[PDB]
């Protein structure tokens, strides 16, 4: 048995900022501080204005990214689990949940902008990090790419859920993991956008 009246619920994912890609300069903006984030995770009620394609999101313990593509805000299952997302009307249930693809999605928040899936086939990609770095990545397979300049894995911590973009700024994938050797990220693993598209098709 167990005492049911004291069973807690997991909080909602909370949008706490965005990676601004609108101008000629990429930069992170914070829209909610830590105390606000904790409260909003509990209530699931977030009245803040949302803008942009890449959101900075937080659970109780971690901060990472979520990316809007085709009207859905996507992130990684290993980060978000089955959590609701906070919104002006209260918690919003996931529209997509797929542990096998490591993928979740919610209806894109009002005010957000969506990326469109890449159709050009380019293997020259750009990873947008949680600190608003735009890192060149050569595509190496369906779900892998190599960093042109390897980095300590710390550099990529917090970027799970962010986008890989083609040269024209279309979505190629969702970053999920670094391939590391002795703490150095030489490559990345991502969820291909075609996998999101199939998820949306049925
Ligand atoms: C992302 O969730 C994030 O930003 N998290 C911060 C806390 C909010 C995070 C980005 C890390 C740079 N992703 C991960 O932590 C992923 C997820 C995916 C499911 C489990 C975890 C582990 N992970 C990783 O990126 C790891 N990488 C790996 O496990 C790779 N393996 C190795 O690097 C390796 C394996 N054997 C020997 C030597 N090295 C595998 C490789 C195959 C594809 C999947 C990733 C770490 C070690 C955390 C970088
Ligand atoms: Zn493209």
Residue numbers in the entry: 980 to 1181
Question: What wording appears in the published article?
Answer:
The HCV NS3/4A protease – a chymotrypsin-like serine protease – is a prime therapeutic target that cleaves four known sites along the virally encoded polyprotein. The NS3/4A protease also hydrolyzes two human proteins, TRIF and MAVS, which are part of the innate immune system, thereby confounding the innate immune response to viral infection. In this study, we report that four chemically representative protease inhibitors – telaprevir, danoprevir, vaniprevir and MK-5172 – exhibit distinct susceptibilities to the protease variants R155K, A156T and D168A. These complexes include wild-type protease and resistant variants R155K, D168A and A156T each bound to telaprevir, danoprevir, vaniprevir and MK-5172, with resolutions ranging from 1.10–2.50 Å; S139A protease variants were used except for telaprevir, which requires covalent bond formation with the serine 139 for efficient binding.
Boceprevir and telaprevir are two NS3/4A protease inhibitors recently approved by the Food and Drug Administration, marking an important milestone in anti-HCV research and drug development over the past two decades. Both boceprevir and telaprevir are linear ketoamide compounds that form a reversible, covalent bond with the catalytic serine of NS3/4A protease. Against wild-type protease, macrocyclic inhibitors danoprevir, vaniprevir and MK-5172 exhibited antiviral potencies in the sub nM range (IC50 = 0.24, 0.34 and 0.11 nM, respectively), while telaprevir potency was significantly lower (IC50 = 1030 nM), consistent with previous reports. In the telaprevir complex, the catalytic serine (S139) was covalently bound to the C-α carbon of the ketoamide warhead. The ketoamide oxygen sat in the oxyanion hole and interacted with the backbone amide nitrogens of protease residues 137–139, while the Nε nitrogen of H57 hydrogen bonded with the keto oxygen. The relatively weak binding affinity of telaprevir to wild-type protease results in a potentially narrow range by which resistant mutations can be tolerated.
